[PDB]
Symmetry: D2
Subunit: 211 residues, 4 copies
């Protein structure tokens, strides 16, 4: 934009692959065969939930021309107490959570969302992903503080050994504590842009994980 | 057949292309050079709005174990009177609508959603896509119920010359009346499954139109 | 080169399509249903034959540090009198030639190779592609003359209505005479580089035609 | 199942990735930082040379209606004593060989080609890949005939630590002796079909290695 009307292509380009370590859920499960129960963790937004609907409504409602809504407690109170009714669960997360429950793993959610007075997100997640009481843990609302990775200390405190996420800070949080960081693709219709460069730390990336 | 742990791949598969007539917005615009203002139409769901958030919420709320919510007046009243605040506008639609408005074309929206006593979808569309009053037209609810007209009939009635849509029936509606049916890709995280085979009738398909 | 060790990617990029009019042999055949026999034409190199072996040997033998071999009659005499024994027929060409024979079309080959005193290329092609005597025509060695498209006059003289080729000059030769130019992908292991931008004239490009 | 004229596609399919451990030459080089000179090995056919031109010519000449040419001493004498002048060196091999030569590694070639009284393949490889005398080693012909040793046995004998190849048996040869087997993609225009499933054993596969 502007760009050629008819750009064309060639077969080198058509076949070209980025050097990324792609994995499947089955390969992950296999890599863990025989490992006793451990703590694992998931980012929420664009990892287990397509939550752009609420973030989109939030932006339009609270800061149509800026990102200020993300620092607005009135927004977080809406986002954490019912707007996830419009959040669409990701199939990759159904498969991963089922797999970790099968293993007897403890499941944590560690999100950059700000903490609120009350939250119904933990219930939404347990219900939608059919997580038994024993495997489920209340969502950790780690917040966002420029200059800090707010998730890293939580991964250490909960002894989380595998952390799934869509953002660079999810992968580097895992790296910070020596955990296995595994990338989920953010959907291209997410309102959180630009899309991250999945694989840019040499981490495993789950195939087809945009849905 | 087994789904092997390590299925591998090969370069025939990597380079394989489906025989699709892909087009860009710029190519479509070029094809209309010198053509006077005309009526054009858009399907709504998965064409201009990723509306799955409301449909997802509707299914959970009104028929968690069936598709009955789609025949439930209580759902439609919610879906057509505010749940599109959580619908995510598609960039392909922003570009198409901008291009057609610039041409002075009349913009119509023709949806298979069930009609309701009131609807705020028209306003949502005009506001989000910055459609001037002179180009905007209230949403048309098309279908097979008594007193309704089909998508085809509405295309005919409004002399719509190009119809954009994600579903097979959008393309056939256009074909049935000699209009130009152009396909938009349904996002893979849509809750309306299975995904259509874009290009199934040899129609033009807009590149990168999943977002 | 140099470039990031771990470049990563994202799902917009993974799904991204160039706006190209891809077609299959079956679609081409269907587009011609009911059309009586006509003359059609094929480029040779990287269209029907992977002839890089001979061109590679030629370069090494006659001009290791330049492109001068392509103006050397000693090279052309080798290339046109047996080095095509090492040229690998393309499956796309088997399918197209079979289809055109089925139609009763007259088949021509129009190549940028230079003419020689004798040539066994016509025999190689008739033999390998099982072309009956009635459909077969002796190869036209049109040569290469910077500033001219040497193929265009031949397409006009033989009333060729469809011309298949891998190079830009094949497509523009067709355009020059009002014929239907259809692009075949040059294989990425061809020694003729850079690869052309297939589709850069808005022409049809045959899927999977690199082999 | 029908192969429809207009099969269409969808964005799940467009974005679909096989779970492959893709790597680049730069990543492999990085993994060897600080490692002293070692022996490394390459398969020949479809790993470093696109040798299909000679194999194609051999099949046509010696067994047009079978695979018997591969057991024909007359073919092998031609194939190993000059027909590689028509073989096209692979760019991936240029990069790997350059990288390993720069490391001071010993370069071995281990092929399943039948042995002959004389062979000029070693010279072809040294000349085309600019392999210095100190790094070069004569081609090893491995197999199951009396007095031969298998690829595995030769890897063991030469203490080859990394083995590059296109076929399953190249990867298993490395695996059988605890060497690092790294896969190169076989070009889709190779006459050796079907193409292998690169990554079938969870091994590293070099990106873009079809040329
Ligand atoms: Mg996230
Ligand atoms: Mg729709
Ligand atoms: Mg050519
Ligand atoms: Mg090989």
């Amino acid at each position: 934009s502007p760009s050629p009307l008819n750009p064309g292509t060639n077969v080198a380009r058509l076949a070209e692959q980025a050097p990324i370590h792609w994995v499947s859920v089955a390969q992950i499960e296999n890599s863990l065969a025989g490992r006793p129960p451990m703590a694992v963790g998931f980012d929420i937004d664009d990892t287990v939930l397509f939550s752009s609907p609420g973030f989109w409504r939030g932006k339009k409602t609270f800061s149509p021309e800026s990102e200020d809504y993300l620092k607005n407690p009135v927004f977080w109170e809406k986002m954490n107490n019912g707007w996830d009714e419009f959040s669409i669960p990701k199939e990759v997360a159904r498969q991963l959570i089922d797999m970790h429950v099968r293993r007897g793993d403890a499941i944590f959610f560690v999100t950059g969302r700000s903490p609120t007075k009350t939250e119904t997100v933990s219930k939404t997640l347990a219900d939608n992903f059919h997580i038994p009481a024993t495997n489920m843990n209340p969502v950790i609302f780690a917040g966002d503080k420029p200059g800090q990775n707010t998730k890293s200390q939580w991964l250490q405190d909960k002894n989380i050994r595998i952390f799934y996420g869509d953002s660079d800070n999810d992968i580097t949080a895992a790296r910070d504590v020596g955990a296995r960081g595994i990338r989920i693709l953010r959907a291209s219709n997410s309102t959180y842009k630009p899309l991250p460069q999945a694989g840019a730390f040499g981490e495993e990336v789950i195939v087809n994980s945009e849905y």
